[PDB]
Amino acid sequence: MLSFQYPDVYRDETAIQDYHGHKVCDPYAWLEDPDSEQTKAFVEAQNKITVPFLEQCPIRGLYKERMTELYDYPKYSCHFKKGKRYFYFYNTGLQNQRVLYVQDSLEGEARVFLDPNILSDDGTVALRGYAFSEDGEYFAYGLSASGSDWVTIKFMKVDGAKELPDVLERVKFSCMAWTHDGKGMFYNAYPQQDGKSDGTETSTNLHQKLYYHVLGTDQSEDILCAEFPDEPKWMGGAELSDDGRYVLLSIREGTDPVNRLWYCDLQQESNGITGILKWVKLIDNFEGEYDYVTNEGTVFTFKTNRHSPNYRLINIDFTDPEESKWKVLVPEHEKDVLEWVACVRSNFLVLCYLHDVKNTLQLHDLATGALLKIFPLEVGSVVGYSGQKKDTEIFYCFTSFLSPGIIYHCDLTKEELEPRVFREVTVKGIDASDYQTVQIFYPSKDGTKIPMFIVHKKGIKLDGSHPAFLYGYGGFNISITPNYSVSRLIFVRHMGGVLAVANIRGGGEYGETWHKGGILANKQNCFDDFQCAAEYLIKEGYTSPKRLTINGGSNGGLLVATCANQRPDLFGCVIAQVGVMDMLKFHKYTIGHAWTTDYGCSDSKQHFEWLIKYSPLHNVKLPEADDIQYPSMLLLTADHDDRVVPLHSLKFIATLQYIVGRSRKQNNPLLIHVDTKAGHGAGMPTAKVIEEVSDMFAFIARCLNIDWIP
């Protein structure tokens, strides 16, 4: 099958570094420089063999055509109200970027408010964050080009959609919060730096500061409200309390769900916002998370995980702040995770729980925390919501594996609450009743039961003859819940596949204990969990090693890459998207330093000892048995992925091709595709999403020689 030759790639055998007495050779360290002619030549040479391989079989064109047809359905986001107007995002079907619409009432004719599509020919300029003024008459929005995390904030006057001259630069991982007087907005920015700041650089991001921009002035005039010079990794995001009296500063260091919480009573400022605010350090440590829900005077309601891994709601009175005085408004549940909470119609709280990886939604009284109403939902996820304190209605968006979703509306001014379907779209060509979703719990190596969703055509025989697509992430307290994916359904319907999603440790499915179960010294638990999911699908007859494909992105890319090294005999195909592969150097680039709370850091001897055992880049090794080779592998990255710098994938593929690719027994391809004008994934235009999925499934089809089922 392989009719190409791997590119010549220079090995710097002098690249030797000592890690606490452990010598580590990094022959491809030169790939860390994205700007060199050597690195640009490497990328060119790799894409030169990968592209023809993906485009050879006509199955890619069949898949692309079906994806283009089926993905072409109306996509609406949850309606939300700001001031006297309603807004919602909508994509007719195949627009590169969804468009923001506005209407003066729910029965009023909607009009285009902000269309990102006209900002570029290829839809590579996308919205990244936005914030309306308290009165809804002004609007700030961030724009990212080519997938970069970097943002340029722009402003508009809502009435007439008038462009304002205000432009903020050097914005990244930023909050956006307007003061209620309508004078200006808080945001974050990074100091100027040598070299580029467009997403192709690898420069570490430190010393993020909190600024305040007065509308109608130049950015050079902005006020510095908070900075942490002695703590370069600290990031402080601002938000205004519901009553506009307080600025709440949430300081984070790392990716754990914890934050310091400082506040500033704006009325106590000597003469408005003129510099460093009079911060009161309410919670001045990183021992727990405090997520503002609402306040009534000095009594602040926060969602926290402080001695509550499944989360709960507490009320902290600023006038009697000692922890022993906090009141538990909604106690922690023994197993279900309280995902998020919103306050609406003054005294209602909307609580969203995760019960065995499925969402539930309910309304509670703010004064007592008592349950008042349960909003009925099918098995799936709540992916959208609107309803702030002053609002008298809520909208909530639902989705699942088999149907696009439903947007629900509920008028909260009614004595008897009657939620109703506001919008519902079904994809013609994908009959949901032909498939089923089942949830099973399988034991991992240590006996822990791990949840796994399996989606397949009804009536299939569990004889191991079906190709399977197993997905996982496992980390950063992220819960992998049901979502609608046309691309995966095409695999099921047109490639006769079985979809599986394993809720492995590291995730947030069972709270902070689930998270802690897949980090630091116990990161191996993630890999073991995932390998056991594969073993389950195989044993129970859903698939077989030669027919199994595993996929994951970012931390999930690390997941699948490590699994390929540890159990090459268990997988037929592996697709690793934008993955962290060099676990010894990840902290040196862009925002990589933030991930040490999940992974550890090689600077530490103890941590190095954990990292070196699973780091994809440092564990590529020819399988011992003659009849075992590495699975077919496809790494996908982009040149503007400044979240997980592409060097991770570049170094990894060079290593796989040299150590494994050159071996005579290796006949499965080990390829990389580096895209242009794209990044980690957020904001990717529809055109690119379609090309990516077509590539992924064409690769699977060719490597496993699967026939297309019309």
XYZ file of C-alpha atoms in Angstrom:
710
model
C 0.000 0.000 0.000
C 2.798 2.467 0.813
C 4.115 4.027 -2.401
C 6.066 6.954 -0.978
C 9.362 7.520 0.836
C 9.714 9.373 4.127
C 11.557 12.719 3.923
C 15.235 13.039 4.842
C 15.323 14.593 8.311
C 18.595 15.687 9.910
C 19.350 14.280 13.361
C 21.291 16.575 15.700
C 23.040 13.846 17.687
C 24.762 16.506 19.822
C 21.418 17.605 21.308
C 21.839 16.048 24.755
C 20.295 17.410 27.941
C 20.641 16.153 31.508
C 17.399 15.846 33.438
C 18.386 15.113 37.051
C 21.077 12.637 35.970
C 18.983 11.224 33.131
C 20.523 11.975 29.729
C 17.959 12.792 27.058
C 18.787 13.069 23.372
C 16.570 15.479 21.342
C 17.870 15.116 17.725
C 14.937 17.070 16.287
C 15.125 20.025 18.698
C 15.724 22.196 15.621
C 12.059 21.708 14.634
C 11.257 23.990 17.609
C 12.030 26.982 15.394
C 8.975 27.543 13.188
C 10.726 30.229 11.135
C 13.818 28.397 9.921
C 14.230 27.271 6.320
C 14.958 23.790 7.693
C 11.617 23.608 9.526
C 9.651 25.099 6.613
C 11.276 22.518 4.290
C 10.347 19.719 6.722
C 6.690 20.727 6.770
C 6.628 21.005 2.966
C 8.199 17.555 2.533
C 5.723 15.975 4.973
C 2.622 17.520 3.414
C 3.974 16.435 0.002
C 3.565 12.738 0.914
C 0.500 13.014 3.165
C -1.825 14.871 0.824
C -1.551 12.454 -2.148
C -2.084 9.533 0.255
C -5.313 11.021 1.638
C -6.634 11.988 -1.808
C -5.870 8.742 -3.672
C -8.978 6.728 -2.829
C -12.304 8.095 -4.193
C -13.761 7.486 -0.729
C -12.499 10.892 0.409
C -14.658 12.543 -2.280
C -17.675 10.425 -1.377
C -17.232 11.317 2.289
C -16.710 15.025 1.520
C -19.832 15.142 -0.645
C -21.925 13.433 2.056
C -20.469 15.687 4.780
C -21.265 18.779 2.677
C -24.826 17.576 2.164
C -25.619 16.456 5.700
C -23.764 19.245 7.528
C -25.885 21.657 5.488
C -28.660 22.246 8.023
C -29.759 25.441 9.867
C -27.710 25.960 13.054
C -29.096 28.296 15.750
C -27.516 29.180 19.093
C -29.465 30.045 22.244
C -31.309 33.367 22.050
C -30.167 35.922 24.643
C -31.428 39.356 25.607
C -29.313 42.480 26.128
C -31.096 45.724 26.953
C -34.297 45.952 24.917
C -33.070 43.590 22.168
C -32.647 39.854 21.506
C -29.595 38.315 19.876
C -28.648 34.867 18.546
C -26.004 33.258 16.369
C -27.143 31.491 13.230
C -25.511 29.738 10.286
C -27.727 28.983 7.283
C -25.841 25.716 6.918
C -22.460 26.025 5.244
C -21.341 29.581 6.043
C -17.708 29.575 7.179
C -18.611 31.466 10.358
C -21.922 31.747 12.215
C -23.515 35.216 12.085
C -24.844 37.287 14.979
C -28.423 38.493 14.500
C -30.507 40.998 16.426
C -34.225 41.613 16.769
C -36.184 44.181 18.725
C -38.585 41.517 20.075
C -39.223 37.795 19.768
C -41.882 38.519 17.086
C -39.781 41.095 15.351
C -37.950 40.720 12.058
C -34.318 39.822 12.731
C -31.405 41.537 11.016
C -27.694 40.868 10.639
C -25.772 42.499 13.514
C -22.258 41.091 12.990
C -21.205 38.916 10.042
C -17.621 37.594 10.389
C -17.724 36.058 6.907
C -17.107 39.396 5.204
C -13.853 39.873 7.169
C -11.961 37.291 5.093
C -12.179 35.348 1.821
C -11.697 31.993 3.530
C -13.484 32.664 6.821
C -10.245 32.548 8.825
C -11.088 35.634 10.890
C -13.439 34.579 13.694
C -15.120 36.061 16.745
C -13.374 35.088 20.004
C -15.241 36.468 22.993
C -17.608 39.409 23.335
C -19.304 41.547 25.932
C -22.296 43.862 25.812
C -22.499 46.913 28.062
C -24.947 46.547 30.983
C -27.629 48.498 29.136
C -27.011 46.551 25.922
C -26.369 49.671 23.845
C -22.662 49.035 23.310
C -20.826 45.891 22.200
C -17.180 44.806 22.414
C -15.979 41.782 20.453
C -12.674 39.996 19.985
C -11.355 38.878 16.602
C -8.750 36.154 16.063
C -7.043 35.601 12.714
C -5.999 32.180 11.387
C -6.951 30.337 14.577
C -4.484 32.152 16.861
C -5.306 32.741 20.518
C -4.265 36.380 20.002
C -7.200 38.778 19.997
C -7.913 42.309 18.786
C -10.953 43.795 20.546
C -13.251 46.065 18.554
C -16.364 48.072 19.500
C -19.815 48.871 18.079
C -22.825 50.968 19.083
C -25.758 48.518 18.973
C -28.382 50.930 17.582
C -27.570 51.056 13.875
C -24.645 48.626 14.266
C -22.208 51.523 14.059
C -18.480 50.756 14.064
C -16.555 52.696 16.724
C -12.838 53.612 16.441
C -11.770 51.832 19.662
C -9.271 48.977 19.076
C -7.404 47.022 21.769
C -4.279 45.013 20.946
C -2.063 42.482 22.799
C -5.191 40.795 24.149
C -5.052 37.084 24.998
C -6.903 34.767 27.473
C -8.906 37.862 28.340
C -11.950 38.743 30.373
C -14.332 41.401 28.951
C -16.451 43.208 31.549
C -18.160 46.592 31.272
C -18.668 48.775 34.337
C -22.365 49.532 34.832
C -21.854 53.271 34.390
C -21.188 52.451 30.712
C -17.910 54.351 30.771
C -15.565 51.543 29.836
C -14.525 47.911 29.972
C -12.058 45.667 31.794
C -9.866 43.359 29.699
C -6.471 41.611 29.873
C -3.329 42.261 27.856
C 0.290 41.087 27.683
C 3.380 43.353 27.576
C 5.037 43.965 24.195
C 7.462 41.238 23.153
C 10.289 40.749 20.663
C 9.421 38.815 17.544
C 5.969 38.037 16.220
C 2.634 37.886 18.013
C 0.475 36.283 15.346
C 0.207 32.681 16.453
C 3.258 31.295 14.634
C 5.654 32.202 17.463
C 6.360 29.918 20.424
C 7.168 32.653 22.941
C 5.946 32.001 26.514
C 3.142 34.270 27.738
C 3.842 35.857 31.121
C 2.867 38.969 33.094
C -0.711 39.231 31.863
C -2.237 42.432 33.337
C -5.756 43.745 33.963
C -6.594 47.031 32.237
C -9.617 49.307 31.991
C -10.461 50.969 28.684
C -12.526 54.161 28.659
C -14.713 54.184 25.543
C -13.703 56.936 23.150
C -10.002 56.980 24.038
C -6.809 55.429 22.634
C -5.509 52.217 24.262
C -2.383 54.096 25.342
C -4.654 55.848 27.868
C -5.916 52.652 29.525
C -5.738 52.277 33.289
C -3.696 49.490 34.891
C -5.985 48.062 37.587
C -4.121 44.911 38.665
C -0.737 43.296 38.030
C 1.366 40.547 39.651
C 5.040 41.325 38.802
C 6.398 38.822 41.369
C 4.100 36.063 40.078
C 4.525 35.997 36.254
C 2.085 33.126 35.720
C -0.862 34.684 37.576
C -3.839 35.726 35.434
C -6.589 37.895 36.932
C -9.962 38.089 35.206
C -12.531 40.728 36.170
C -16.314 40.662 36.276
C -18.871 43.052 37.697
C -21.391 41.933 40.310
C -25.039 41.821 39.122
C -25.748 45.135 40.879
C -22.688 46.826 39.371
C -21.241 47.727 42.765
C -18.268 45.377 42.888
C -15.486 44.300 40.547
C -14.622 40.666 41.347
C -11.125 39.541 40.475
C -10.541 35.827 39.917
C -6.812 35.085 39.894
C -5.644 31.785 38.458
C -2.285 30.050 38.164
C -2.417 26.789 36.245
C -5.485 24.907 35.033
C -6.941 23.448 38.253
C -10.455 24.603 39.131
C -9.254 26.978 41.862
C -8.834 30.730 42.156
C -8.067 33.570 44.523
C -11.037 35.951 44.753
C -10.457 39.618 45.516
C -13.088 42.358 45.343
C -13.330 46.090 44.904
C -16.393 48.058 46.007
C -16.386 50.670 43.231
C -18.147 53.238 45.380
C -15.179 53.124 47.779
C -12.767 54.319 45.084
C -11.493 57.813 45.896
C -12.192 59.236 42.408
C -13.408 56.503 40.036
C -11.079 54.010 38.331
C -7.722 55.867 38.157
C -5.167 53.115 38.775
C -4.556 50.088 41.012
C -7.925 49.505 42.733
C -8.434 49.091 46.489
C -8.601 45.303 46.274
C -9.903 43.464 49.357
C -8.350 39.965 49.384
C -11.363 37.864 50.445
C -9.925 34.520 49.303
C -6.148 34.918 49.003
C -4.996 31.393 48.173
C -5.463 28.761 45.435
C -7.155 26.137 47.630
C -10.577 26.170 45.981
C -12.796 27.554 43.255
C -15.183 30.465 43.816
C -17.443 31.115 40.847
C -19.691 34.158 41.330
C -23.424 33.394 40.943
C -25.138 36.518 42.362
C -25.202 38.782 45.429
C -27.871 40.513 47.480
C -26.102 43.365 49.178
C -23.011 41.965 50.887
C -24.204 38.314 50.736
C -22.454 36.691 47.786
C -23.499 33.351 46.377
C -20.638 31.306 44.852
C -20.382 27.870 43.267
C -17.366 26.249 44.952
C -15.528 22.960 45.248
C -13.951 23.965 48.588
C -14.112 20.627 50.462
C -16.806 19.641 47.980
C -15.396 17.779 44.962
C -18.832 17.500 43.331
C -19.416 21.257 43.862
C -21.967 23.167 45.933
C -23.370 26.642 46.480
C -22.232 28.740 49.448
C -23.094 32.282 50.590
C -20.183 34.382 51.819
C -21.153 37.625 53.571
C -18.456 40.246 52.944
C -19.241 41.726 56.389
C -18.652 38.366 58.144
C -16.172 36.602 55.772
C -14.598 33.941 58.025
C -15.131 30.464 56.567
C -16.871 29.120 59.670
C -19.597 31.710 59.009
C -20.341 30.731 55.389
C -23.810 29.369 54.796
C -24.249 26.288 52.584
C -27.117 27.268 50.280
C -27.238 24.127 48.112
C -25.208 21.272 49.652
C -22.943 19.020 47.627
C -24.548 15.950 46.087
C -22.968 12.571 46.895
C -22.247 11.786 43.247
C -23.731 14.269 40.775
C -21.593 17.196 39.732
C -23.061 20.692 39.873
C -21.694 21.900 36.518
C -22.828 25.524 36.513
C -25.338 27.857 38.122
C -27.087 31.013 36.887
C -29.292 33.564 38.670
C -32.365 34.830 36.815
C -35.548 36.826 37.480
C -33.969 38.208 40.666
C -34.553 35.267 42.993
C -34.339 32.117 40.892
C -31.237 29.956 40.449
C -30.840 27.657 37.461
C -28.716 24.619 38.363
C -27.236 22.214 35.832
C -26.086 18.817 37.138
C -24.131 16.010 35.468
C -25.651 12.633 36.458
C -23.636 9.749 35.028
C -22.449 11.957 32.142
C -25.926 13.257 31.247
C -27.296 16.714 32.057
C -30.260 17.618 34.237
C -31.607 21.181 34.649
C -33.605 22.578 37.531
C -34.817 25.795 39.126
C -34.234 26.650 42.802
C -35.211 29.470 45.193
C -32.311 31.880 45.824
C -33.304 32.540 49.459
C -33.352 28.920 50.666
C -31.786 26.943 47.841
C -34.950 24.815 47.650
C -35.750 22.914 44.447
C -38.795 24.397 42.686
C -38.942 22.895 39.206
C -37.241 20.243 37.108
C -36.903 21.052 33.421
C -37.401 17.743 31.558
C -34.650 16.650 29.178
C -33.814 13.626 27.054
C -30.442 11.887 27.459
C -27.777 14.350 26.387
C -26.125 17.691 27.179
C -27.121 21.304 27.848
C -24.783 23.312 25.602
C -26.374 26.754 25.696
C -28.218 28.968 28.186
C -29.405 32.546 28.659
C -31.026 34.229 31.631
C -29.321 36.862 33.766
C -30.530 38.428 37.020
C -32.734 41.078 35.445
C -34.167 38.712 32.833
C -37.652 37.224 33.259
C -37.146 34.283 30.928
C -34.572 31.607 30.132
C -33.526 29.825 26.944
C -31.603 26.579 27.116
C -30.056 24.535 24.338
C -29.894 20.721 24.323
C -28.014 18.274 22.100
C -27.246 14.546 21.965
C -25.474 11.969 19.790
C -28.399 11.374 17.428
C -30.165 14.713 16.904
C -28.871 18.306 16.342
C -30.727 19.538 19.374
C -33.589 21.599 20.698
C -33.717 25.184 21.951
C -36.210 25.554 24.814
C -37.784 28.721 26.214
C -39.473 29.373 29.549
C -41.280 32.541 30.619
C -40.463 32.841 34.330
C -43.113 35.500 35.090
C -45.791 32.788 34.863
C -47.214 31.312 38.066
C -47.097 27.898 36.425
C -43.900 27.410 34.437
C -44.490 25.901 31.000
C -41.208 25.331 29.121
C -41.672 25.129 25.356
C -39.715 24.106 22.272
C -38.475 27.361 20.727
C -36.488 25.809 17.865
C -35.791 22.286 16.634
C -33.981 21.148 13.501
C -33.565 17.601 12.228
C -31.052 16.429 9.643
C -32.664 14.742 6.634
C -30.547 11.759 5.665
C -29.813 10.669 9.228
C -32.814 8.837 10.654
C -32.153 8.885 14.424
C -34.464 5.913 15.037
C -32.080 3.664 13.083
C -29.457 3.989 15.832
C -29.127 3.686 19.586
C -26.893 5.008 22.353
C -26.034 2.749 25.248
C -24.038 3.560 28.355
C -21.905 0.895 29.955
C -19.417 0.932 32.822
C -16.261 -1.143 32.423
C -13.556 -1.902 34.992
C -10.117 -0.410 34.423
C -6.822 -2.053 35.453
C -7.263 -1.104 39.121
C -10.947 -2.051 39.098
C -12.401 1.458 38.846
C -15.598 1.463 36.774
C -15.337 3.894 33.846
C -18.390 5.114 31.876
C -18.498 4.632 28.102
C -21.129 5.656 25.554
C -21.468 3.424 22.482
C -23.488 4.516 19.451
C -24.359 2.047 16.708
C -26.983 0.825 14.246
C -29.750 -1.186 15.904
C -29.632 -4.955 15.428
C -25.919 -5.334 14.703
C -24.331 -8.639 15.692
C -21.497 -8.340 18.209
C -19.171 -10.543 16.146
C -16.138 -8.215 16.074
C -16.557 -7.404 12.375
C -17.322 -3.684 12.709
C -14.861 -0.813 12.414
C -14.949 1.322 15.570
C -14.045 4.922 16.331
C -13.103 5.336 20.010
C -12.720 8.867 21.380
C -11.268 10.153 24.630
C -9.743 13.239 26.261
C -9.088 12.549 29.979
C -7.842 15.637 31.773
C -8.287 19.231 32.928
C -11.606 18.528 34.654
C -13.294 18.494 31.247
C -16.351 16.223 31.026
C -16.906 14.565 27.637
C -20.685 14.618 27.279
C -23.069 13.694 24.398
C -22.855 15.992 21.363
C -24.129 15.918 17.827
C -21.611 15.097 15.185
C -22.593 14.610 11.537
C -19.012 13.521 10.753
C -19.137 10.640 13.208
C -22.647 9.662 12.087
C -21.409 9.388 8.491
C -18.819 6.926 9.809
C -21.632 4.928 11.389
C -24.078 5.042 8.464
C -21.747 5.129 5.449
C -18.774 3.200 6.813
C -20.767 0.819 9.021
C -18.951 1.910 12.137
C -19.507 1.914 15.887
C -18.810 5.139 17.807
C -17.502 4.999 21.396
C -16.611 7.748 23.878
C -14.830 6.690 27.080
C -15.186 8.928 30.130
C -11.704 8.175 31.469
C -10.109 9.723 34.597
C -8.580 13.199 34.483
C -11.974 14.423 33.290
C -14.637 16.071 35.421
C -17.352 13.430 35.072
C -17.244 12.496 38.736
C -15.946 15.765 40.108
C -12.526 16.770 41.350
C -11.788 13.217 42.555
C -12.229 12.031 38.970
C -9.947 14.871 37.859
C -7.239 14.062 40.428
C -7.457 10.430 39.358
C -5.921 11.299 35.982
C -3.213 13.843 36.768
C 0.361 14.126 38.030
C 1.661 10.805 39.400
C -1.562 9.154 38.286
C -1.644 10.318 34.660
C -1.018 6.689 33.647
C -4.547 5.982 34.918
C -5.833 7.852 31.836
C -3.925 5.624 29.438
C -4.848 2.445 31.315
C -8.521 3.526 31.344
C -8.485 4.154 27.580
C -6.674 0.924 26.742
C -9.284 -0.891 28.854
C -12.097 0.756 26.872
C -10.545 -0.638 23.668
C -10.248 -4.064 25.322
C -13.934 -3.863 26.291
C -15.095 -3.035 22.738
C -13.003 -5.926 21.490
C -14.037 -8.543 24.077
C -17.757 -7.686 23.859
C -17.614 -8.034 20.103
C -18.160 -4.471 18.887
C -14.898 -4.490 16.946
C -11.425 -6.054 16.622
C -7.859 -4.651 16.909
C -7.380 -4.442 13.114
C -10.640 -2.499 12.782
C -10.251 -0.106 15.694
C -9.411 3.580 15.313
C -8.706 5.837 18.295
C -8.930 9.629 18.217
C -8.275 12.543 20.540
C -7.190 16.183 20.377
C -4.927 18.397 22.530
C -4.613 16.500 25.836
C -6.542 13.831 23.892
C -3.816 13.874 21.240
C -1.358 13.011 24.016
C -3.792 10.274 25.065
C -3.911 8.481 21.729
C -0.204 8.995 20.951
C 0.815 7.434 24.264
C -1.659 4.598 23.703
C -0.052 3.902 20.320
C 3.366 3.545 22.012
C 2.090 1.450 24.955
C -0.319 -0.876 23.136
C 0.385 -0.786 19.366
C -1.208 -4.232 19.152
C -4.579 -2.895 20.277
C -5.200 -0.354 17.516
C -5.404 -0.364 13.751
C -5.476 3.399 13.270
C -4.683 6.408 15.459
C -5.566 10.030 14.658
C -3.911 12.505 17.029
C -5.082 16.082 16.645
C -3.001 19.026 17.884
C -1.428 16.945 20.630
C 1.104 17.649 23.359
C 3.891 15.179 22.505
C 7.000 16.547 24.161
C 6.166 16.223 27.845
C 9.610 17.428 28.877
C 9.393 20.757 27.069
C 5.692 21.674 26.872
C 5.995 24.274 29.634
C 8.511 26.388 27.662
C 6.095 27.637 24.997
C 3.173 30.072 24.805
C 0.633 29.099 27.522
C 2.137 25.658 28.183
C 3.200 26.693 31.672
C -0.478 26.667 32.663
C -0.714 22.874 32.179
C 1.743 21.866 34.905
C -1.134 21.451 37.384
C -2.275 18.439 35.307
C 1.079 17.116 34.126
C 3.824 18.216 36.468
C 6.970 19.926 35.196
C 10.270 18.314 34.149
C 12.191 20.860 36.249
C 11.110 18.749 39.225
C 12.891 15.425 39.710
C 9.751 13.656 40.976
C 7.685 14.967 38.061
C 10.353 14.135 35.479
C 10.154 10.548 36.719
C 6.438 10.343 35.900
C 6.685 12.267 32.622
C 9.530 10.297 31.073
C 7.515 7.062 31.329
C 4.651 8.192 29.065
C 5.889 11.212 27.066
C 5.033 10.300 23.438
C 8.224 11.812 22.020
C 10.402 9.778 24.412
C 8.700 6.395 24.169
C 8.726 5.542 20.462
C 10.112 2.006 20.340
C 9.859 -0.852 17.863
C 7.473 -3.532 19.146
C 9.441 -6.593 20.308
C 7.325 -9.271 18.623
C 7.919 -9.757 14.894
C 4.205 -9.930 14.062
C 3.500 -6.566 15.690
C 4.025 -3.142 14.159
C 2.735 0.326 14.955
C -0.859 1.168 13.943
C -1.359 3.521 11.000
C -1.001 7.021 12.459
C -2.094 10.455 11.330
C -1.039 13.588 13.225
C -2.979 16.756 12.440
C -1.757 20.234 13.351
C -1.697 23.797 11.980
C 0.877 26.526 11.678
C -0.993 29.031 13.840
C -1.712 26.609 16.667
C -0.259 28.735 19.412
C -2.154 26.775 22.101
C -0.125 23.590 21.522
C 2.784 24.735 19.351
C 3.150 22.516 16.241
C 6.739 21.554 17.098
C 5.158 18.883 19.335
C 3.732 17.073 16.312
C 6.767 17.874 14.091
C 9.229 16.308 16.507
C 6.933 13.362 17.149
C 6.426 12.452 13.467
C 10.155 12.775 12.728
C 10.777 10.292 15.529
C 8.067 7.834 14.463
C 9.332 7.853 10.881
C 12.952 7.342 11.868
C 12.578 4.715 14.632
C 9.491 2.933 13.342
C 9.018 4.008 9.708
C 12.428 2.712 8.600
C 11.800 -0.741 10.045
C 11.156 -3.435 7.455
C 8.084 -4.790 9.265
C 6.378 -1.407 9.379
C 3.878 -1.193 6.523
C 1.286 1.066 8.165
C 1.786 4.767 7.277
C 2.968 7.320 9.887
C 1.925 10.714 8.531
C 1.431 14.343 9.487
C -0.665 17.072 7.893
C 0.178 20.656 8.819
C -2.581 23.046 7.747
C -2.241 26.748 6.986
C -4.241 29.723 8.336
C -5.521 27.603 11.225
C -4.755 26.946 14.873
C -5.795 24.714 17.743
C -9.363 24.482 16.421
C -11.561 27.214 17.909
C -12.940 29.448 15.179
C -12.075 27.002 12.359
C -14.222 27.869 9.301
C -16.761 25.355 8.003
C -14.738 24.828 4.816
C -11.779 23.678 6.908
C -13.897 21.532 9.239
C -15.161 19.637 6.197
C -11.656 19.131 4.756
C -10.380 17.906 8.113
C -13.100 15.283 8.678
C -12.849 14.137 5.054
C -9.104 13.600 5.619
C -9.615 11.748 8.908
C -12.163 9.311 7.560
C -10.456 8.833 4.190
C -7.320 7.888 6.142
C -9.304 5.375 8.214
C -11.005 3.988 5.111
C -7.733 3.474 3.249
C -5.709 2.055 6.149
C -8.419 -0.434 7.149
C -9.683 -0.863 3.529
C -13.311 -0.176 4.419
C -15.939 -0.055 1.668
C -18.283 2.909 1.406
C -21.943 2.019 2.035
C -24.118 4.361 -0.128
